[PDB]
Amino acid sequence: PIETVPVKLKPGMDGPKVKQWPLTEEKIKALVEICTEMEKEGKISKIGPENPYNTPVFAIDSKWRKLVDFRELNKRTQDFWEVQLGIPHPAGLKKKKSATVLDVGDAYFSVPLDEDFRKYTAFTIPSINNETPGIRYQYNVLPQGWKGSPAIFQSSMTKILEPFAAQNPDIVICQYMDDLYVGSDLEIGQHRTKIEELRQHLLRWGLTTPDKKHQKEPPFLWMGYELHPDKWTVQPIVLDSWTVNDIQKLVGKLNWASQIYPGIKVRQLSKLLRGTKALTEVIPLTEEAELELAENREILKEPVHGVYYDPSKDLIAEIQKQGQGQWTYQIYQEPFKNLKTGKYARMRGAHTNDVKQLTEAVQKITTESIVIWGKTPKFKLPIQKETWETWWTEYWQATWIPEWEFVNTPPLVKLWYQLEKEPIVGAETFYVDGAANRETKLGKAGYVTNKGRQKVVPLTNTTNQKTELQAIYLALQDSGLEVNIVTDSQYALGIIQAQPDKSESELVNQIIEQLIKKEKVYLAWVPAHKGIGGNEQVDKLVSA
Amino acid sequence: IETVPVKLKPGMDGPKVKQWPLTEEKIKALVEICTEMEKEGKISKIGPENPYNTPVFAIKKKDSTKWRKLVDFRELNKRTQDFWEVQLGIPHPAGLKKKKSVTVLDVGDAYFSVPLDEDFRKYTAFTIPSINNETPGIRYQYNVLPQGWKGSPAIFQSSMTKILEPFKKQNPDIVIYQYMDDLYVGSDLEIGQHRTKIEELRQHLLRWGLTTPDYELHPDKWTVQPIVLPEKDSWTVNDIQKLVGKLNWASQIYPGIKVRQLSKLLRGTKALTEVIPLTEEAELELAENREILKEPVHGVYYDPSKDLIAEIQKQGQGQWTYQIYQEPFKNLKTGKYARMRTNDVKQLTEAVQKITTESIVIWGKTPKFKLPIQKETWETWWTEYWQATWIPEWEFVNTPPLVKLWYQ
Numbered sequence: 032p033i034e035t036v037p038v039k040l041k042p043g044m045d046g047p048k049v050k051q052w053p054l055t056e057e058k059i060k061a062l063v064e065i066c067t068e069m070e071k072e073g074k075i076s077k078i079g080p081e082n083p084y085n086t087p088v089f090a091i092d093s094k095w096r097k098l099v100d101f102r103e104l105n106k107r108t109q110d111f112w113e114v115q116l117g118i119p120h121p122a123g124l125k126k127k128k129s130a131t132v133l134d135v136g137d138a139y140f141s142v143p144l145d146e147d148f149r150k151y152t153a154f155t156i157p158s159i160n161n162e163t164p165g166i167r168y169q170y171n172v173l174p175q176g177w178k179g180s181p182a183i184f185q186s187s188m189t190k191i192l193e194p195f196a197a198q199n200p201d202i203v204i205c206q207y208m209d210d211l212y213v214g215s216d217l218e219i220g221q222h223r224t225k226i227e228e229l230r231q232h233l234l235r236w237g238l239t240t241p242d243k244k245h246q247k248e249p250p251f252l253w254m255g256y257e258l259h260p261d262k263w264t265v266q267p268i269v270l271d272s273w274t275v276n277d278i279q280k281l282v283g284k285l286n287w288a289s290q291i292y293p294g295i296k297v298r299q300l301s302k303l304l305r306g307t308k309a310l311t312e313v314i315p316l317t318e319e320a321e322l323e324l325a326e327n328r329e330i331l332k333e334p335v336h337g338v339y340y341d342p343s344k345d346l347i348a349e350i351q352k353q354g355q356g357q358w359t360y361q362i363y364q365e366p367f368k369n370l371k372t373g374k375y376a377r378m379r380g381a382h383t384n385d386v387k388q389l390t391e392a393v394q395k396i397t398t399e400s401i402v403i404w405g406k407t408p409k410f411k412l413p414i415q416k417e418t419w420e421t422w423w424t425e426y427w428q429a430t431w432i433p434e435w436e437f438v439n440t441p442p443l444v445k446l447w448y449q450l451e452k453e454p455i456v457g458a459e460t461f462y463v464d465g466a467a468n469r470e471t472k473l474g475k476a477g478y479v480t481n482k483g484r485q486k487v488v489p490l491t492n493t494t495n496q497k498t499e500l501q502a503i504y505l506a507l508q509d510s511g512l513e514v515n516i517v518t519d520s521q522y523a524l525g526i527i528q529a530q531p532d533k534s535e536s537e538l539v540n541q542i543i544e545q546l547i548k549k550e551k552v553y554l555a556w557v558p559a560h561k562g563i564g565g566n567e568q569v570d571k572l573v574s575a
Numbered sequence: 576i577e578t579v580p581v582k583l584k585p586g587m588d589g590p591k592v593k594q595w596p597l598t599e600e601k602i603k604a605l606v607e608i609c610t611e612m613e614k615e616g617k618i619s620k621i622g623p624e625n626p627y628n629t630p631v632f633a634i635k636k637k638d639s640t641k642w643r644k645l646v647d648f649r650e651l652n653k654r655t656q657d658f659w660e661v662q663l664g665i666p667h668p669a670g671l672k673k674k675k676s677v678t679v680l681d682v683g684d685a686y687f688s689v690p691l692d693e694d695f696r697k698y699t700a701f702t703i704p705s706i707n708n709e710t711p712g713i714r715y716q717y718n719v720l721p722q723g724w725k726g727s728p729a730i731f732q733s734s735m736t737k738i739l740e741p742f743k744k745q746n747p748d749i750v751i752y753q754y755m756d757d758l759y760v761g762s763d764l765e766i767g768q769h770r771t772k773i774e775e776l777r778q779h780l781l782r783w784g785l786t787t788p789d790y791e792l793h794p795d796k797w798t799v800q801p802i803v804l805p806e807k808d809s810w811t812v813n814d815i816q817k818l819v820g821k822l823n824w825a826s827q828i829y830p831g832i833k834v835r836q837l838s839k840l841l842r843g844t845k846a847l848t849e850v851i852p853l854t855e856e857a858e859l860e861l862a863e864n865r866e867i868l869k870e871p872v873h874g875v876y877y878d879p880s881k882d883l884i885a886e887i888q889k890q891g892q893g894q895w896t897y898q899i900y901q902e903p904f905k906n907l908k909t910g911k912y913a914r915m916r917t918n919d920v921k922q923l924t925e926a927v928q929k930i931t932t933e934s935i936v937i938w939g940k941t942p943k944f945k946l947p948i949q950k951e952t953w954e955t956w957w958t959e960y961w962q963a964t965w966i967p968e969w970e971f972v973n974t975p976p977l978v979k980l981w982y983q
């Protein structure tokens with residue numbers, strides 16, 4: 032009785048036409064038996080040779096089911112509105128007095144197929160002997176392996192549910208694939224009463240559900256979770272094997288555990304998986320990564336459970352700086368009962384700031400909260416309000432953080448150095464510069480100072496930008512606690528101005544370490560080759 | 576009513592844009608708004624054979640309790656409106672900028688009476704999202720002219736001209752321009768007379784069936800931010816170095832700038848804090864450049880076939896500077912906004928809407944902004960402070976303008 036969804040093929044393409052591969056006669060009789068039963072129930076109907084289209088059929092106790100390869104038909108079938116890939120996260124669920132799983136049987140076969148599209152779903156039963164022409168059929172309902180069957184089933188289920196949902200606004204119905212998860216806070220008696228009403232309502236539309244064979248409430252082993260009536264957790268995770276693929280599956284299991292297990296670290300192991308591409312290839316076990324596996328095994332020994340969600344209470348997210356470039360966070364409402372946990376790693380890039388990384392993690396957690404709970408959390412962050420205010424006011428970019436409160440949990444996020452906004456009086460003025468020959472990959476760096484100091488160092492395997500940064504480093508090393516540096520390198524000025532906390536460049540890190548020891552540093556920029564006095568002198572010294 | 580046939584540009588498929596996650600309050604508002612719209616026939620629910628989708632958001636729009644639906648038709652417009660810009664385009668009045676006062680009215684409710692071509696409605700598909708993927712999203716398509724779609728004002732243009740003809744005849748001195756969903760009404764009258772005329776126009780539309788919701792721009796006061804060199808009694812080496820850098824920069828915008836005599840001051844390896852007397856030749860060189868910078872820039876013309884580009888820089892203390900250009904150093908306009916004192920994002924959002932409004936009034940076109948903010952930050956919170964019925968195109972610059980601001 033369900034209304035059909037009009038379906039069309041892609042404009043350029045046309046219906047499939049494939050040849051059926053031969054098969055064993057025992058399978059052929061089995062396919063014959065299966066197709067005769069389906070024909071009786073209206074699911075499939077025999078066709079003549081007027082139809083030109085065919086797609087290959089196959090057969091696979093404990094078994095002998097029918098499989099059809101619709102890949103060609105799928106390639107020719109229009110795109111649909113895709114079903115939702117994201118699965119409900121258990122931490123987003125609200126505790127309910129009772130909750131029931133009503134899985135739908137033969138779900139696709141209950142829903143009709145567009146009459147004009149049925150022709151393309153045509154299949155030919157293999158003939159037992161090559162001499163006879165095989166029997167031919169066409170689907171009248173949604174084929175199992177077809178592109179539009181998942182989406183058309185979902186829309187049909189939504190239509191069937193909409194009236195009953197309005198009649199019973201108290202009941203909460205969740206749709207995921209063929210399963211319908213129903214929760215409520217009625218008394219146990221009225222819950223079963225409405226569950227039975229829902230079962231009857233689906234039956235009028237030809238959808239069948241378990242009755243008193245419903246899955247048991249404690250062992251909700253759903254999509255890798257345990258859904259207890261009072262809590263949720265990750266299903267038990269196992270894990271020594273050193274193949275590349277074995278490492279990848281280990282890292283996946285650790286990430287999946289990190290939803291609720293705090294402190295799971297994967298940074299060292301992720302460095303092991305660096306485009307090797309050889310799943311069989313064994314990897315050397317760095318002691319840094321090998322210890323990392325040991326730490327996780329200690330954590331995984333502790334059984335961890337998460338709580339469900341309470342709309343009346345506030346969402347709190349708290350973030351801890353773990354290591355370098357790694358951040359860990361917990362989201363909770365009650366003081367020690369966590370809704371879930373997670374990690375955020377430094378996004379790819381060099382010259383990063385701990386303050387900048389913290390903001391991005393706040394950004395990531397904020398978006399995650401909206402997906403799961405529909406509101407944004409209150410944050411507990413390991414940064415002083417004085418540090419953040421200094422950073423935002425002087426930062427070149429527009430930044431914002433929601434309401435937050437300092438937590439004195441070290442390590443604390445701090446600005447390791449701050450540059451001077453005005454030239455320092457009584458401080459030596461270093462005019463630095465660098466240059467290198469691109470073909471030779473060789474160059475030089477140095478400085479010329481107001482007091483007459485000068486220096487040039489020879490360099491090898493360097494680029495022009497590296498020399499420009501190197502000259503700044505040379506001045507920093509050969510300077511007192513207060514120094515004024517004048518450069519023409521926009522590249523150099525930009526890195527230093529961004530106040531990077533660290534980087535992958537050992538030179539930049541050295542510059543950072545020199546900058547932190549300095550009491551005051553002022554960096555000024557001047558146009559190159561414009562006749563500025565100090566810059567002109569150093570340019571001849573470095574490049575010649 | 577008959578429906579104008581509408582076609583996407585050839586070799587184009589309808590928009591397939593991901594719905595950004597929403598808050599529970601915004602989802603609840605959107606379901607309430609769309610429930611009523613479906614009853615009135617403006618929209619209706621759609622099946623899974625419609626693969627297209629366009630984002631939907633909810634803005635307060637300065638209404639204390641009223642929630643407004645905003646559809647982000649930027650992708651559909653790019654695939655539709657350019658064809659509609661030529662065939663059914665709308666002219667732009669060069670005098671709206673000259674007018675003393677311009678008021679902006681929302682005429683979006685007008686479009687809902689005119690129907691849309693049945694072969695085009697599928698491209699107007701949007702999805703009301705769901706929390707934690709607990710339910711499939713509610714899916715609708717428009718049966719009438721959508722509010723954010725640039726084809727809607729083009730189709731209604733005939734009906735708008737008929738409705739406004741009586742008022743325009745009685746008030747020939749008032750300029751009326753229609754950018755998508757909005758009516759820009761410009762007068763040179765006193766504000767109280769202008770305000771009374773505006774209410775008269777609102778009543779006129781209401782009598783003819785166009786409901787108007789229940790700001791005041793002053794384009795004559797608008798002036799560009801001119802380049803201004805510092806004026807000092809004593810100059811440090813740092814001062815002269817910065818002056819050389821700023822003058823060197825302005826050479827790209829202003830031909831005629833000289834830094835020869837001023838650079839000669841900087842001969843030698845002197846300390847930054849050292850005061851330098853200015854040679855009379857350099858004093859002349861600095862004075863000459865000031866006059867060159869004092870003169871308004873000349874020789875930049877708006878090319879309608881090109882995009883406009885808006886760059887924004889975060890100055891301190893709530894100030895923002897911006898430049899609108901089509902060519903890298905040929906600026907059609909530059910300005911500076913000061914905040915009343917507010918989140919940086921709220922300030923940036925306000926800046927973007929102010930610039931777009933000015934760009935609409937001046938050129939009848941919206942610029943593509945280069946926003947100095949992280950993408951995820953902007954995507955999460957731009958809707959919070961957004962009051963406009965349109966959405967400009969934007970991109971994100973994560974590279975700091977390490978080059979000194981030199982925009983004040």
Ligand SMILES: N#Cc1ccc2c(Oc3ccccc3OCCn3ccc(=O)[nH]c3=O)cccc2c1
Binds near residue numbers: 126130214
């Ligand atoms: N298998 C399976 C299965 C079963 C129920 C699901 C589900 O069940 C629910 C359906 C509607 C509303 C709340 C739901 O769960 C809230 C959390 N919860 C969950 C289970 C339980 O006993 N008690 C409990 O308070 C919500 C989401 C996914 C579910 C998956």
